[PDB]
């Protein structure tokens, strides 16, 4: 019935999909093994989709933009899924589906495989600035979009530094009310910075667009740019290359996390960490000697 579940999901059975996602989200070691066989079976039916990441600060307008984009897309014949890695008009529609960082990252990546196997051709993955969540989403999508504020000199308030460089497309949102002209200036400032950061880029220099997600303006143009991104990368053979690299990278991350977890989650290492850290912070112990004691203690109690 792993085979049964896989037949149901790829056939479009709407009841099978949530159950597969639950199987996939199960931390229970016996479910992990079934989940893996199911994914192995569905892997060949996946990949036929554009995965788009969406980030920006609380209140910048991510969920408003996502609802609007999702309707834009549904009306053009797509089947759209929305996941979040920490929208009522959208969630009612039959062609939409709305649903540790290591743990949530893993469950989200596996869930994408199920959704694509189930016929979803657009996958929107939303995140906020929590820990390393932006990098995790950027590493599982084709196109990563950053929403910013439409204020000259203040577009990136509250964004973790380094996040700008993850973006394939940058959007100055809320380009309405008293800020039409200002949004254009704000966009031109970000474009100037992107030109500095990507001075001789030949394939894809991140465009900067304006949008009013609440007035439904610039959404279509945003999606037109997302499609151009895929077309440009596909013509260079880089769309498939990025995916293959992400998958290999993720494989090694899983290896890393498995071996590091043995140490990090050891209760006795947990008990003595503070004092070993205090001793390092105070110059009483070298980092190499603290590291050795951490490994010795893990080994003694594993």
Ligand X SMILES: Nc1nc2c(ncn2[C@H]2C[C@H](O)[C@@H](COP(=O)(O)OP(=O)(O)O)O2)c(=O)[nH]1
Contact pick of 34, 46, 63, 293 for ligand X (by CB under 6 A): 63
Contact pick of 51, 109, 174, 229 for ligand X (by CB under 6 A): 174
Q: Mark 188-227 with x for binding to Cl ion (rule: CB under 5 A) and - for no binding.
A: ----------------------------------------
Q: Is 218 annotated as a binding residue?
A: no
Q: Mark 177-196 with x for binding to ligand X (rule: CB under 6 A) and - for no binding.
A: x-------------------
Cite the DSSP H helix spans in the chain.
2-11, 16-25, 29-42, 62-74, 88-91, 101-117, 133-138, 180-197, 219-235, 238-264, 267-281, 287-300
Contacts of 208 (CB under 8 A, 6+ apart): 169, 170, 171, 172, 187, 188, 190, 191, 194
Q: Taking CB under 6 A as the rule, does residue 68 contact ligand X?
A: no
3-class DSSP assignment, residue 50: strand
Residue with tokens 């950053």: 146
169 pairs with which residues across the strands? 145
Contact residues toward its own copies (CB under 8 A) are 32, 36, 39-40, 43-44, 46-47, 106, 110, 153-157, 161-162, 164-165, 189-190, 192-193, 195-200, 244, 247-248, 250-252, 254-256, 258-260, 262-263, 276-277, 280-281, 283-291, 294-295
Element (H or E) spanning 146, and its range? strand 143-149
111 pairs with which residues across the strands? none
State how far the Cα of 115 lies from the Cα of 60, in Å rounded to an integer.
27
Q: Taking CB under 6 A as the rule, does residue 62 contact ligand X?
A: yes
For residue 156, the partner it binds in its own copies, ligand X, Cl ion, none, with Cβ less than 5 to 8 A by kind, is: its own copies
Return the structure tokens found at 268. Answer: 């006795």
Contact pick of 85, 107, 117, 213 for ligand X (by CB under 6 A): 213
Q: Is 213 annotated as a binding residue?
A: yes
Residue ranges of the binding site for GTP = 56-64, 176, 212-214
């Amino acid at each position: 019935t792993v085979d049964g579940l896989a037949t149901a999901v790829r056939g479009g059975d709407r009841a099978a999909l949530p159950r597969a996602i639950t199987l996939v989200e199960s931390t229970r070691p016996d479910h992990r093994e079934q989940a893996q066989q199911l994914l192995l079976r569905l892997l060949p039916d996946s990949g036929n989709a554009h995965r788009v990441g969406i980030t920006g600060v609380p209140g910048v307008g991510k969920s408003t933009a996502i609802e609007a984009l999702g309707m834009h897309l549904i009306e053009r014949g797509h089947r759209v899924a929305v996941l979040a890695v920490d929208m009522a008009r959208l969630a009612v529609h039959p062609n939409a589906y709305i649903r540790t960082l290591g743990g949530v990252t893993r469950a989200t990546r596996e869930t994408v495989v199920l959704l694509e196997a189930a016929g979803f051709d657009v996958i929107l993955i939303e995140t906020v600035g929590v820990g390393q969540s932006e990098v995790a989403v950027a590493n599982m999508v084709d196109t990563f979009v950053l929403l910013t504020l439409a204020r000259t000199g203040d577009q990136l308030q509250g964004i973790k530094k380094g996040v700008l460089e993850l973006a394939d497309i940058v959007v100055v949102n809320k380009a309405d009310g008293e800020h039409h002209k200002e949004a254009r200036l704000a966009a031109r400032e970000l474009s100037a910075a992107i030109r500095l950061i990507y001075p001789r880029e030949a394939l894809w220099r991140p465009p900067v667009l304006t949008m009013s997600a609440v007035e439904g303006r610039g959404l279509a143009e945003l999606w037109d740019t997302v499609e151009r991104h895929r077309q440009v990368l596909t013509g260079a053979g880089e769309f498939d290359a990025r995916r293959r690299d992400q998958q290999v990278d993720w494989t090694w991350q899983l290896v890393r996390d498995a071996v590091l977890d043995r140490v990090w989650s050891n209760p006795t290492v947990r008990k003595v960490r503070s004092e070993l850290e205090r001793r390092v912070r105070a110059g009483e112990l070298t980092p190499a000697l603290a590291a050795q004691q951490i490994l010795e203690i893990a080994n003694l109690t594993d």
